[model samples]
Target: KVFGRCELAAAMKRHGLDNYRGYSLGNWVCAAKFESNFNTQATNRNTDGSTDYGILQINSRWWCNDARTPGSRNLCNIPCSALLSSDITASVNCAKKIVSDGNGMNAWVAWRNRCKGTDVQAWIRGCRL
Candidate 1:
């Protein structure tokens, strides 16, 4: 099956989504499903041979600026170096911003619109996380 649900929960908790249980878990799972099918170690080979890794599909080069760090460019795949840094809140907040950005639930609403009838787990493939 997909990654164990508890493992998924742990990832959410690690990213500070635990307290956001009500609206967050569903959204976080949706984000995971949209990104790499919940594969924590998932990586995408870019045309240049660089990689995009982890859940949430973080582009380490773009966001974390350190591809060497696992979750730097990706999500739960590689542990984040800044997990304990002041930026931790910024990182999680950024995710929240994307969800609540522009269209006010624009991202989630889009997910709902496009993913409603299909396998929810499969929808993560197209997500930017």
Candidate 2:
């Protein structure tokens, strides 16, 4: 499922992503924009053979189980497929885990390279919540 910019922000806020783990709503919004373009079904395969799934581009290597990756921790104890749902409950929950895993939001290249250290308020300016 593809989400509009504000649509995604609103949904993420409802799921507790606003300032989650010290990252602002804009930070999450900007990262999500670059990560999957707010697409719930987005997937990308890494050279290490692990896959990134869903709106947050969650990795199969540590967060979720895809049954195809080796040495998967599946720490979130969820199927990778769950991350692809438009509901975003699973994806947001998994994302919470990833950010707190000693890596913080640095786990996502999009956040580190793009969203971090920027004035990201524009990402949510049009949306009140």
Candidate 3:
């Protein structure tokens, strides 16, 4: 999975905003890029059409609908299925919330270790600039 600069910038804009940190966002972007190539529209098939969906590869069929909000183009809106559908930024934000106190890229590293490898290594190795 490799992310183009455009996708990385978009995700960073939504997730990091003015607080964008090159190393951290770069790391997270690396993880997502390696995992899905920054394709917000990417999807994996599940036993049912309900579960296992969206960017960051959210599983919507099982996850609570309450998490899915509306009109939020960001994956943050769970109901939009954007949360579990075509929104990479939303998933990145959710993952960020889980790991970081909204501060750094450790969350990304953690996710990479859990999902990819303990030391799998990222494809891109720079800041978001």
Candidate 4:
């Protein structure tokens, strides 16, 4: 399902992405938009032979174990298929692992692309949360 901009932000808050790892909910909003256009079932492939799953583009390389990526750490202890669920619990938790793994949010190229310098606070101005 595709989320409205405000709806996405609200969901992120519910899952504790707000203030996570010192990154603001605004940052979460930006990354999520560019990462997957707020599509719960979005997907993309990396040249490294791993696929990115769901809204934050959580990768199969180390974050989620797809069993397709060789030697995947599965640090999130989750299946890649879990990422696309509307529940978003698995997807959101895996993200916490990725950012907390020393790099913070820079692990997402999509985050780097726009959220890097984007006015993140402005991103959630109308979210009412």
Candidate 5:
């Protein structure tokens, strides 16, 4: 499912991720924009043949499992397909786990390359929540 910016922001807030694990809501918003453009079913195959799944682009190599890729740590203990759901609950929980693991939002290259140190307020500009 695709989400508008405000809708996505509201969801994030409801999930208590507005400033989760020391990362700002804007950071999450920016990361999501660059990672999957708020499309829940988004997926991308990495050069290594590993794939990223869902809005946060959680990787199959460590976070989730794709049948085509074996030996995944599956730290989230969830199938990669679970991340593709529009509900976002699973994805948000997995993301929180990821941030807890270390590197924070730096776990995502998209955040480092696009969101980090940038003026991300615009990502949450009109989202009152």
Candidate 6:
């Protein structure tokens, strides 16, 4: 699903991601912008032969399965396709699990690469809470 930045922020806030799991809402917003531009249907095949799914670009190797990919741990016990929907509840739930696993935003390469230590307020700027 397609979402403007502010729209996504509101949705995420409704999902309790505003400061959820010890990470700031701005961190999540910036990571989503770099990960999938807030598109829930986004998918990308990584060089490591794993596919990223949905808005957070969850990895197929550990979080979900694509059926074609072998040796998937499927730690999240969720189908990758389930994440690619307008309703992000499943994705948000999975993301919470990921963060609770002690990785925090470090689980996302986009967060570490682009959002970490950067001024990301613009991502939430003008967004009315």
Q: Write the per-residue lDDT of candidate 1 for residues 54-115, one digit (tens) a residue.
A: 55544454444445533334433334344223233434554554444344333444346654
Query: Roughly what TM-score does model 5 have, to 2 decimal places?
Result: 0.96
Cα error of candidate 4 at position 3, Å: 0.9
lDDT of 5 by residue, 67-119 (tens): 77766688999999999998999999999999999788999999999999999
Q: Residue by residue across 17-118, what tens digits does model 3's lDDT show?
A: 423443444455455654455666655554544433334554453332433323223333344255544445566556544444454544434344653434
lDDT tens readout by residue for model 2, 79-114: 999999989899999899889888899899998999
Residue 48 alpha-carbon offset, candidate 5, angstroms: 2.0
**Which scores better on lDDT, 4 or 5?**
5
Measured by TM-score, the strongest candidate is 2
Worst 10 residues of 2 by lDDT: 120-129
Task: Write one digit per residue (lDDT tens) for candidate 6, span 1-129.
Answer: 788999998999999998887777889899999999989999998777889999999989888878867777888888899999899888999899898888778999999999999987778899987
Taking all chains together, each candidate's TM-score versus the true structure is 0.45, 0.97, 0.48, 0.95, 0.96, 0.93
What local lDDT score does residue 117 receive in model 6, on the 0 to 100 scale?
94
Q: What is candidate 1's TM-score against the reference?
A: 0.45
What TM-score does prediction 6 earn? 0.93
Model 3: how far is 92 from its true place, Å?
3.5
lDDT of each candidate versus the true structure? 0.49, 0.92, 0.47, 0.88, 0.91, 0.89
Clashes of each: 10, 0, 9, 0, 0, 0
After superposing all C-alphas onto the true structure, candidate 1 shows an RMSD in angstroms of 8.8
Q: Give the candidate number with the greatest lDDT.
A: 2
Between prediction 2 and prediction 3, the one with superior lDDT is: 2
RMSD of 6: 1.2
- Residue 129 C-alpha lDDT in model 3: 48
Q: Flag regions of model 4 displaced more than 4 Å.
A: none
